Structures are given as C-alpha cells and as structure tokens.
Amino acid sequence: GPDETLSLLADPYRFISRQCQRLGANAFESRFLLKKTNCLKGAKAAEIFYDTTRFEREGAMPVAIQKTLLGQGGVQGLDGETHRHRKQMFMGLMTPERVRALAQLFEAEWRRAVPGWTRKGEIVFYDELHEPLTRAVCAWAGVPLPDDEAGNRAGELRALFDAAGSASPRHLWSRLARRRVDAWAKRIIEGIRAGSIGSGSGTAAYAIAWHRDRHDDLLSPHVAAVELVNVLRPTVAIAVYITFVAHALQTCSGIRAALVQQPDYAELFVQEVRRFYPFFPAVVARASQDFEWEGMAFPEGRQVVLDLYGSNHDAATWADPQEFRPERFRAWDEDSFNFIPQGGGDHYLGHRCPGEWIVLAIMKVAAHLLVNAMRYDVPDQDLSIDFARLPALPKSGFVMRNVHIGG
Numbered sequence: 001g002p003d004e005t006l007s008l009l010a011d012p013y014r015f016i017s018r019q020c021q022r023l024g025a026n027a028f029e030s031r032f033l034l035k036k037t038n039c040l041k042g043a044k045a046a047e048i049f050y051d052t053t054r055f056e057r058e059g060a061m062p063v064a065i066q067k068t069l070l071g072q073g074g075v076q077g078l079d080g081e082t083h084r085h086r087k088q089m090f091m092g093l094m095t096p097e098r099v100r101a102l103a104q105l106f107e108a109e110w111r112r113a114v115p116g117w118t119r120k121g122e123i124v125f126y127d128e129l130h131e132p133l134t135r136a137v138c139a140w141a142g143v144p145l146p147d148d149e150a151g152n153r154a155g156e157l158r159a160l161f162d163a164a165g166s167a168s169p170r171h172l173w174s175r176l177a178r179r180r181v182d183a184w185a186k187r188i189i190e191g192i193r194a195g196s197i198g199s200g201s202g203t204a205a206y207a208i209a210w211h212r213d214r215h216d217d218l219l220s221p222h223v224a225a226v227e228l229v230n231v232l233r234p235t236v237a238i239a240v241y242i243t244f245v246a247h248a249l250q251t252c253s254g255i256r257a258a259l260v261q262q263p264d265y266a267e268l269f270v271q272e273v274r275r276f277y278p279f280f281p282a283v284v285a286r287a288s289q290d291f292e293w294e295g296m297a298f299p300e301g302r303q304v305v306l307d308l309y310g311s312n313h314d315a316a317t318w319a320d321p322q323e324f325r326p327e328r329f330r331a332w333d334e335d336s337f338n339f340i341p342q343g344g345g346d347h348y349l350g351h352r353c354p355g356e357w358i359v360l361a362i363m364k365v366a367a368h369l370l371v372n373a374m375r376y377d378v379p380d381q382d383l384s385i386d387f388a389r390l391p392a393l394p395k396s397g398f399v400m401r402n403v404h405i406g407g
C-alpha cells in the first residue's frame with residue numbers, strides 16, 4: 001500500500017473516520033512511515049485495543065515524542081505488571097480530596113490572574129491559561145515555584161505539548177523545553193530525596209520521588225523527573241479544554257442559560273466538551289501476538305492506531321454526534337469503551353488517563369467562573385476550530401476584551 005503519513009498529518013483528527021466512512025467499515029489497513037498500520041475506530045475496536053493479552057505499548061512511542069511531549073522511561077511505554085505497578089503510583093494521587101484541593105488552587109490562581117487581564121484590555125484566552133495552571137499544579141504537587149519563574153516554567157511546559165506536534169522551528173523549541181523541564185524536575189526529585197525540599201507526604205512530587213518499583217528500588221532520578229512532568233504537563237494542557245469551554249459558551253445557543261439555571265448541567269456540559277471537541281487525536285499500540293478480528297489480520301508486531309476523535313463521533317454510539325448537546329449524557333451508561341477522549345478501558349489495568357478527575361474538576365471550575373464570575377466581551381474573530389493544528393484550538397485562540405471579575 002501507499003504511505004499516507006502526509007494525508008494523516010494534514011487531517012490528524014478526521015483522516016481515519018473519513019476513510020472509514022468511505023470504506024463503510026470501522027477499520028482499514030494503511031501505512032505511516034515504515035510501518036503498515038491497522039487504523040481502528042468505535043466502541044468494539046476500543047475494547048480489543050485495550051485487551052492487553054493482544055496489545056502492548058513497548059516500542060510504540062516515536063523518538064520525536066520521547067524528545068518532546070512524553071520524555072523517556074515514563075508509564076506510557078510500559079506493559080504488564082511493570083506498567084500496572086507504575087500506574088498505581090499515579091492513581092493514588094487522585095483522591096476526591098486531593099482533586100478538590102487542586103481545583104481550589106486553580107480557582108485561586110485564575111482569580112489572581114484576572115487583574116492582569118483587565119489591565120491588558122484584550123487577551124488571547126488560551127495564552128493566559130498556562131501560567132495560572134502551572135502555578136496551581138506546582139503548588140498542589142509540592143513543586144517549589146518562585147513567583148518570578150512561574151511564567152517561564154509555564155512556557156516550557158506549554159512547549160512540550162503545544163509545539164510538539166508542530167512541523168516548524170517550534171519543534172526545536174519543544175526539544176529544548178524537554179531537556180530543560182527534565183533537568184528542573186530532576187533537581188526537584190533530588191532535593192526531595194536529599195531532604196533539601198520539604199514536599200508534603202500527600203503530594204505528587206513526594207509520591208514520585210519516594211516511589212519504589214517492583215524490586216523495592218527508587219526510580220532513577222531521570223525517570224522520576226519524567227513521571228513528575230507527566231503530572232505537571234498535561235495539567236497545563238487543560239488550557240485547551242478551558243478554551244473549548246469558552247468556545248462552546250460563545251457558539252452554542254442556550255448553553256450559558258442552562259449552565260446558569262440548571263444545577264446538574266455542569267457535569268453534562270464538561271463531558272460533552274470532551275466528547276465534541278478534538279484534543280487527543282489517537283493512541284498507538286502494537287499487536288503482541290497473531291490474531292484475526294472482524295475479518296482483519298493482526299500479525300504479531302503490527303502497529304495499530306485507535307482513533308479517539310472518530311470513536312467519540314461514532315453515529316452508531318451517539319446517533320447525532322455532530323451536534324453539541326450536553327443532554328445526551330443523561331442517557332450514558334458509563335461504558336468504558338464508547339466514550340474515550342482520554343482513553344478507554346480500566347485505569348488500573350490499562351493505559352487510560354489517570355488525569356480524568358482533575359480534568360473534569362478543573363473544567364467545572366472554568367465553566368463556573370466563565371458564567372457566574374467573569375464578565376468579558378468577545379469581538380469579531382475567527383472562532384472556527386483548527387483541525388490542522390495539534391492540539392486543535394479555535395483559530396483565534398479565543399480573544400476576549402474588557403475582562404473583569406468584580407461585575
């Protein structure tokens with residue numbers, strides 16, 4: 001078959017579901033770079049993708065991603081009992097109490113940032129979110145962050161994910177940002193271990209610095225650093241979802257009113273933001289043994305990609321996936337495979353995002369502040385979603401004018 005790396009890169013979110021629609025199937029064989037790849041979409045495909053007797057992650061992460069978005073040696077590249085033991089370290093962080101504490105820190109940081117936004121007169125909303133998130137998550141995680149370094153650290157964390165999937169000199173900045181953030185996080189881990197940094201026993205940095213692997217050994221300092229970044233970085237990336245929350249409030253009639261008046265609505269709304277908007281395009285794994293599924297061959301070693309966006313827009317599951325309708329979540333049965341913006345399956349037994357509770361809690365804070373606290377004007381701008389960008393964003397970045405929180 002032809003190599004279609006370029007076709008995929010031009011339409012990273014929609015390429016798979018578009019081909020699926022043309023072929024009338026939920027799976028097709030393709031090729032990206034050197035590797036024949038089976039592309040999968042939908043609930044049944046997600047269920048097989050998360051079967052760890054048939055799929056492994058070892059060696060599926062590209063070098064370019066190790067050097068930017070994810071780092072080297074982290075939980076994403078692990079399988080089996082080694083993976084599950086490392087995953088438990090992240091899950092232990094996510095108690096209702098700790099998630100609430102992070103949400104509260106983020107509201108405080110958002111409120112702290114508003115006067116700056118007022119004084120600026122006009123802001124790019126997306127651009128302004130990274131720093132308050134950075135401040136909140138570092139405080140929550142037990143990571144010291146001097147006031148005069150917060151801006152710079154926020155830019156470096158942003159560069160790991162916002163510049164990672166950019167085929168421009170921005171990728172070179174992403175690589176440098178990765179080297180810097182690893183060295184910084186490593187100094188944090190070392191200081192905790194030496195006792196020079198007093199992170200509390202409940203905090204992410206403490207848990208990661210003192211984690212013991214399956215042989216009762218501490219993580220090497222570089223791996224501990226990478227895992228700490230695996231908490232800090234994607235929390236800052238919630239800027240993307242917060243921007244989409246603002247976008248939905250601006251472009252979908254009746255949403256603001258429903259959020260204002262109906263109490264149970266916020267939960268439905270943030271879930272629909274995660275379903276509707278493109279963010280994490282797709283996940284990659286490798287077949288661990290020969291098998292056949294739905295008449296498709298999966299030879300041992302075959303690269304397989306699971307299309308998250310397409311799955312979240314599958315008409316078989318949702319009926320009218322093209323509409324933004326929070327109400328649809330009244331009928332959801334909490335299935336582990338049919339709604340997968342942050343992965344599918346089980347959080348402990350597979351690679352599903354442990355950050356979901358944090359994401360939901362922070363999106364709820366954002367929705368609350370944007371409807372009940374913030375006042376802002378939205379000038380004429382290009383609000384259309386850039387499906388060519390990784391991560392996707394409204395083309396304008398969501399521009400606000402005359403922002404205040406006292407009214």
Ligand code: HEM
Pocket residue numbers: 075076077087090230231232234235237238239241279280283308341342343344350351352353354355356358359
């Ligand atoms: C900002 C929005 C976020 C999105 C769209 C997102 C999405 C995802 C996806 C799709 C995966 C991969 C699932 C798989 O490989 O099968 C993942 C994994 C992961 N996420 Fe998130 N996530 C977000 C936020 C967060 C947050 C706030 C945290 C903080 C702890 C986090 C931590 C992780 C970690 C450590 C993994 C690797 C888990 C593993 O491999 O077992 N994520 N996420």
Ligand SMILES: CC(C)Cc1ccc([C@@H](C)C(=O)O)cc1
Pocket residue numbers: 069161162164165233234235237279280281390391
């Ligand atoms: C770089 C591409 C693959 C898109 C992308 C994936 C994940 C994130 C967040 C959730 C993160 O993990 O930091 C941000 C962007």
